[PDB]
Amino acid sequence: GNFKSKLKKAMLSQQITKSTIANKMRLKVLSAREQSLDGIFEETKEKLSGIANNRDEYKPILQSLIVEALLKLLEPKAIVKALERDVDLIESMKDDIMREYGEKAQRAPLEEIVISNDYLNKDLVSGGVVVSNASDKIEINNTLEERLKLLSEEALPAIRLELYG
């Protein structure tokens, strides 16, 4: 009776090691996959800083980030938070940002760009901008880090299939 019972018991403990082998294999494989993914993304943001810190190359990129946000804002004044070197950059192409929104939307040119006195850290993001409503009802968070994070959702299947599919 007990031979058979203690025997069933250890045959069950035997398959818990199969289950720990199968879980530990699959945990290692997958955690090596995650580590590669965070080196693809890590390299994206080391290149992005490199682009952002060269201001003249960056100038069109900044314009289109703000303009992308304005198409989803659709308010008559927009409040823009930028980096220290990028509030000056915006200022000197105020005319080109509101021009370019009026030619790329139906909505009539943004009447004002409000240059913020609250600034973003290099400690949070690599750059980019926070475009928000005037009364601060809605924010289109169009920062470089926020954008890469959002990108990751759609890029993840593309990359998973190419590498490991």
Binding site: L27, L30, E34, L37, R160, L161
Partner: peptide
């Protein structure tokens, strides 16, 4: 406490 969900399709 495992790794990412992973996708291949949404």
């Amino acid at each position: 406490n495992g790794p990412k969900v992973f996708a291949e399709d949404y």
